[PDB]
Each structure stands twice: as structure tokens, then as C-alpha cells.
Amino acid sequence: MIPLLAFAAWSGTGKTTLLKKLIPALCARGIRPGLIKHTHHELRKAGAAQTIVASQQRWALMTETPDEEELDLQFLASRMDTSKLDLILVEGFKHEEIAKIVLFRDGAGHRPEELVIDRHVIAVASDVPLNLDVALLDINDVEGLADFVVEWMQKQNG
Amino acid sequence: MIPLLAFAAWSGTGKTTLLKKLIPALCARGIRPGLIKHTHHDMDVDKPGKDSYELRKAGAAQTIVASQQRWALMTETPDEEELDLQFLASRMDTSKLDLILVEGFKHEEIAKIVLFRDGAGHRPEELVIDRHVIAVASDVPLNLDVALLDINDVEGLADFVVEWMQKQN
């Protein structure tokens, strides 16, 4: 039920670095964030399809998917314990049919006209002015980005 | 919903080694097992803890890393350890499982098989067999209240688990 928000950028634009700065800023504001990331590349090998491993510091659930990739984002969010969370950030999926902020950096090897802005995009965080039908954000102002995220949250109540 | 079954033994008796061979044997009969385990190691070091380390270090309290062949959820518990067995089992996707095996916890209050190996230096008289025990798997004959299984007969053990499972449904 809690809000899901994707972040999208071309490689080399500095998305991971930005996320790493954005999370503590959200935390500082009382937000408890989750994150879902898509990547490429003995008793599990013995054949337990699902394994929980619990320690003092933390616990893990590991789910083997040998025949078909798990790509249903709403299903994955539902695995998290949302009683402990206010927001789930998302990155790296193809058919992201949720709200999305796009990152742009002018010297990062792409012209502004190459940007693809679909109907789910709510904002573009950029280091130069752009001609757009959505909110335009300063990508080098993380505090201000945290502001925009919180306000978007306080509007998603339902 | 689905049956939970613990395996219990003193350290060094042969619990993890036994489970290493039983799980394949169950899978061969078409049983799809889950596993819940306790560990004393630092989960940040492997695979897949390492994959989510930077994001959790920055403040992400729960992470999922999803790829072609598998996905992993991590839940940070910096205040108190998670030891609620029924909660843990409920976070599994039980629509795709038949049986959940449980191992390594100090307190495990469910159906249980207890293990004994003579050469481990303990006397059989020191075995604690409470009301939850359905069998003792042993390498020496014991005359017991509950079933007595050969700890070295893995297929026999897999048969006994199926038969117990039939009584649950």
C-alpha cells in the first residue's frame, strides 16, 4: 500500500552515487526507506528453493528462480514488511509502470533530445535547464530532491 | 498451512551434514522443501549480503536484489534479533512449498527429529526428549518411547518424513 518510486538514468549519469546520498537525507526526515534493485550477474545447491538465514544483526530470504525471472514489481514489494516502512525506491527494471524520476547530466555523453519521457515520469533531476511538461529539479541539490520526494509522498495517501 | 519440522542435536553431532543429503533426497520424490537456519557469522561478507551492503550502509532498512536466476530480501535488525519462527515461516511463499525444515535455533517448539552419534562423546542418557520429538536418528540401537531411525539410512529417513507429512494434511 505504501508508495513505490523508480529512479532511472543512463549508465555514467551517477544514479548509484545519488541514491547513496538521497537515502540518509530521507532518513534524516523521519522516512524509513526500502529499496528494490534489479541487477545482471551448499544446502541451496542441495536444493532448497527458499531459504531463510537469521543472525543477530539481520535476516535474509533467498528465493531460487531457475525457470523464470521474477519481474512482477508489486509482488516483490509485497515480500517486504511494509509495517516497518514509509517508501520503497526502485531501480533497474524495464517495465516499470510506477511513478519515476529521470536523471540527466549534460556532460555525461547524451544530448537532452535523447531523453525518453513516458507518461509515468514525475520529474527530471538535471544539471542544465530543460524544456519539459513535468517538474524540473536540480540534480546537484540532494536536500531539495529529498523535499520533492517527501511532498510527492504526502500526496499519495490513497 | 504447511508443516514445520526441526532437526535438533548438540554441536558437532552432524546436523548440517545430514540436511545436506536429506534435502536432495526429498526433492527427488517431488517434495519442495523450505529451510530456516540460524547462523553466528556476519551476513555482510557473502553473496548475497555483499550485493546490498552499500545501500543498507547508507540507511536502507530492507533491500531486495533481483536477478535472472534468483532474488534475495535483507532485513536489518540493529535493535533486537528476529527469532519468531512462525513469523519467519509466514514470510516464505508457501504456495510453492510443501515442507519447511528448521535448524540451529536455541529454542524450537515444533515437531522435531533429534540426532545421536555415539562417537561424539555424550552418553545417550543425557538426551532430552520433550513432547515435540517424533523420532531419534541414531547410529546405535536405543530402545525408545518414540521411533528409532538409522542416521546413516538417508532414504529410510526420507520415507519417514513423507509418512509423517501425510498425517499432517
- Give Cα separations from B109 to A58, B106, B122 (angstroms): 22, 10, 23
Give the separation between CA A150 and CA A42, rounded to whole angstroms: 43
As a whole number of angstroms, the distance between CA B158 and CA B29 comes to 9
> How far, in Å, CA of A53 to CA of B37, rounded?
5
What is the least distance, in Å, from the CA of A52 to any CA of chain B? 5
Mutate which: B67, B88, B108, vs A, most A CBs within 10 A: B67
Residue A104: φ, ψ to 5°: -135, 135
Rounded CA-CA distance A126/A111 in Å is 12
Nearest to A61 among B68, B91, B96 (CB): B91
CB A43 within 8 Å of CB B102? no
Experimental method: X-ray
Nearest CA in chain A to B37: A53
Question: B21: how many CB neighbours lie within 10 A of its CB?
Answer: 13
Residue B37, strand partner residues:
A53, B103
Q: Which helix (H) or strand (E) holds B21?
A: helix B15-28
**Per the structure block, which three cell numbers stand in for A126?**
538535471
Nearest residue of B to residue A40, measured between CA atoms: B67
User: Shortest CA distance to A103 belongs to which of A156, A142, A71, A154?
Assistant: A142
Pairing state between β A87-91 and A4-8: parallel
If you count residue pairs, one on A and one on B, with CB atoms under 8 Å apart, how many are there? 180
Instruction: Name the phi and psi angles at A8, rounded to 5.
Output: -130, 135
Q: Which residues contact B133 (CB under 8 A, 6 or more apart)?
A: B112, B113, B114, B146
Q: Judge if the upstream peptide bond of residue A33 is cis by omega within 30 degrees of 0.
A: no
What one-character DSSP code corresponds to residue B96? G
The one-letter code for the residue type at B120 is A
Cell numbers given for A98: 510506477
- Distance CA(A121)–CA(A123), nearest Å, equals 6
Give ∠ CA B58-B59-B65 in degrees, rounded to 5.
Answer: 85
Which amino acid is present at B76?
Answer: E
Look-up of cell digits 532437526: B7
Q: Is A15 labelled a binding residue?
A: yes
**Cα B19 from Cα A105, distance rounded (Å):** 52
Asked if the Cβ–Cβ distance from B67 to A19 is below 8 Å, we say no
Burial of B6 (0-12, 13-18, 19+ CB in 10 A): buried
Do B82 and A70 make contact, defined as CB atoms within 8 angstroms? no
- Going by the DSSP 8-state scheme, the letter that residue B14 receives in this structure is S
B11-18: long-range contacts at Cβ-Cβ below 8 A with a sequence spacing of 24 or more?
A: B12/B120, B13/B115, B13/B116, B13/B117, B13/B120, B14/B115, B14/B117, B14/B151, B15/B103, B15/B104, B15/B115, B16/A43, B16/B103, B18/B115, B18/B137, B18/B151, B18/B154
Element (H, E) at B159: helix B154-166
Instruction: Compute, in degrees rounded to 10, the torsion defined by CA atoms B40, B88, A49, B59.
Output: -70
Which of B4, B71, B84 best tests the A interface by mutation, with the highest count of A CBs <10 A? Answer: B71
* Cβ neighbours of A27 in B, within 8 Å: 59
> Which parts of chain A fold into alpha helices (H)?
15-28, 43-46, 73-79, 142-153
For the annotated binding site of B, the residues are 12-16, 46-49, 95-98
Is there a contact between B65 and B48 (Cβ–Cβ < 8 Å)? yes
Q: Is A12 annotated as a binding residue?
A: yes
Residues linked to residue B5 through DSSP beta bridges, in sequence order: B101
Provide the total of helices (H) and of strands (E) in chain A, helices listed first.
4, 8
Residues 6+ apart with CB under 8 A from B22: B154, B157, B158, B161
| Interatomic CA distance for residues B68 and A39, integer angstroms | 8
CA distance B55 to B57: 5
Which amino acids of B are annotated as binding site for GTP, given as ranges?
A: 12-16, 46-49, 95-98
Structural domains in chain B plus CATH codes: 1-47+81-169 (3.40.50.300), 48-80 (2.20.25.120)
Round to whole Å and give the CA distance between A75 and A98: 13
